[PDB]
Write a protein that binds this ligand. Structure first.
Ligand code: HEM
Ligand SMILES: CC[C@@H]1C(=O)OC[C@@H]1Cc1cncn1C
Length: 464
């Protein structure tokens, strides 16, 4: 009846001394090279259990999937959410807001023809945008996020933002900034020492500012929607939820009230924007570093699709190389290295170890994506990871950027279809040029913390 081994914590600071807040993953991966695939850490006051490799992670989150289905803290987002919404909540609230969210996204056609024709249409609205930069050197950052956010916006708001909207440019700035903070040294020190640091001046404060800015906005769309509602036919995600808040007024235990609504919508709007767009911004850089991979994707396009029409999402079965490249950007790029934290919601026996009720769990998603048993060159960019000798597509149990188990990314379906199309559609129209030689492109991360962020680069989209 004892915890997993680990370095001796100090009082209050925990294992501050053996942790590099500038790369948290490598610090935790060094400790496991010494203790094992399951060890115990303290980030400040918080006792965490950290899981390493495909085996540790799968047996935790899938084989005992119920007991590891809790949610732990991300103190940056916990300052805003306070345990409300679909993503950062626990128990009876998590199961209801999740059950309702999946059912509703399917209403608006996630992984269906509706959202296909929305993405397909927005993808062309971006093609125009990039054909009108005329080959000149740009930052791809806010072009991509604009386009990516517009898909999720259609679902949650009822329609899209205009690309010329000054206030829209602002909301995307608020996501990029709050998100990049979680990845920085101070971001990872804030995980450790939130209790103190939320009252101290510093970068943390600028990130509450933008979080606060984001909530405000969403709560202004909830007001406008609320007063102009039509109870017998819904326009968007907010409306459907409003319709369920009415029906649930007689029930005092309901999880469908104003604050849960507002929080769950931000979960969706924030996640539908910054994780598919970073993945693309990373993927472009990885394509200009690897020109022989770019040329091969282009060729698979012209023979399967051509130049005339617009790529669908079933054009995908006849495209094994391009679908490998997209899985390999997703695995190399390593979006959320430690995932969202979990928690055991009751006393738990796991592998001879004991985990008390409320124990926090770090499922290292990045160490599965770099499990050397499943990948032959774990830290190189090789699309042959996702192919066999006959050139067809090879699924891997260690491809887990979207997590596994009971609290896994229900936004995975939307994201898969978005990635395929955006990537195919852009590269069907343009080839990418860098202002620097392929041997001189630094494809290593700028910040790695809660997210993996790629470095800054300028680029050209010149037509074919
Ligand atoms: C490449 C893009 C994306 C990646 C790599 C990604 C990855 C992840 C990961 C690792 C989790 C953690 C789940 C856990 O607790 O174990 C997660 C959760 C979540 N994701 Fe995504 N995600 C992406 C895009 C999206 C999109 C487009 C949406 C919008 C519908 C979304 C919505 C969510 C939500 C609501 C959760 C919380 C689930 C819960 O706590 O029940 N994600 N995602
Ligand atoms: C930026 C934090 C995001 C949020 O508020 O809701 C969930 C989320 C974390 C996340 C999950 N999938 C993508 N992201 C960025």
């Amino acid at each position: 009846g004892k915890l997993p081994p680990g370095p001796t914590p100090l009082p209050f600071i925990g294992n501050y001394l053996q942790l590099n807040t500038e790369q948290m993953y490598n610090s935790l991966m060094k400790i496991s090279e010494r203790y094992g695939p399951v060890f115990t850490i303290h980030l400040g006051p918080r006792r965490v259990v950290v899981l390493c490799g495909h085996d540790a992670v799968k047996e935790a989150l899938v084989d005992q999937a119920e007991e590891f289905s809790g949610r732990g803290e991300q103190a940056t987002f916990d300052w805003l959410f306070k345990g409300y919404g679909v993503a950062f909540s626990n128990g009876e609230r998590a199961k209801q807001l999740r059950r309702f969210s999946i059912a509703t996204l399917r209403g608006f056609g996630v992984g269906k023809r509706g959202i296909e024709e929305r993405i397909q249409e927005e993808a062309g609205f971006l093609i125009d945008a990039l054909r009108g930069t005329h080959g000149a050197n740009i930052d791809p950052t806010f072009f991509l996020s604009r386009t990516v956010s517009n898909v999720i916006s259609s679902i949650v708001f009822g329609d899209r933002f205009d690309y010329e909207d000054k206030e829209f440019l602002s909301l995307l700035r608020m996501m990029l900034g709050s998100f990049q903070f979680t990845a920085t040294s101070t971001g990872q020190l804030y995980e450790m020492f939130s209790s103190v640091m939320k009252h101290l001046p510093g970068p943390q404060q600028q990130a509450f500012k933008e979080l606060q800015g984001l909530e405000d906005f969403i709560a202004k769309k909830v007001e406008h929607n609320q007063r102009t509602l039509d109870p017998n036919s819904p326009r968007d995600f907010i409306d459907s939820f409003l319709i369920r808040m009415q029906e649930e007024e007689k029930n005092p235990n309901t999880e469908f009230y104003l604050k849960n609504l507002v929080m769950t919508t931000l979960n969706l709007f924030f996640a539908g924007t910054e994780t598919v767009s970073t993945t693309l911004r990373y993927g472009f850089l990885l394509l200009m570093k690897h020109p022989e991979v770019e040329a091969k994707v282009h060729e698979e396009i012209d023979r399967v699709i051509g130049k005339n029409r617009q790529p669908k999402f079933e054009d995908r079965a006849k495209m094994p190389y391009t679908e490998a490249v997209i899985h390999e950007i997703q695995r190399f790029g390593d979006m959320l290295p430690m995932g969202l934290a979990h928690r055991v919601n009751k006393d738990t026996k796991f592998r001879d170890f004991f985990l008390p009720k409320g124990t926090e769990v770090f499922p290292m998603l990045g160490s599965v994506l770099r499990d050397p048993r499943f990948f032959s060159n774990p830290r190189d960019f090789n699309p042959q990871h996702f192919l066999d000798k006959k050139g067809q597509f090879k699924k891997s149990d260690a491809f887990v950027p979207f997590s596994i188990g009971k609290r896994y990314c229900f936004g995975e379906g939307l994201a898969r279809m978005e990635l395929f199309l955006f990537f195919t559609t852009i590269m069907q129209n343009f080839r990418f040029k860098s202002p620097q030689s392929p041997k001189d492109i630094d494809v290593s991360p700028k910040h790695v913390g809660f997210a993996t962020i790629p470095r800054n680069y300028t680029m050209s989209f010149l037509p074919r």
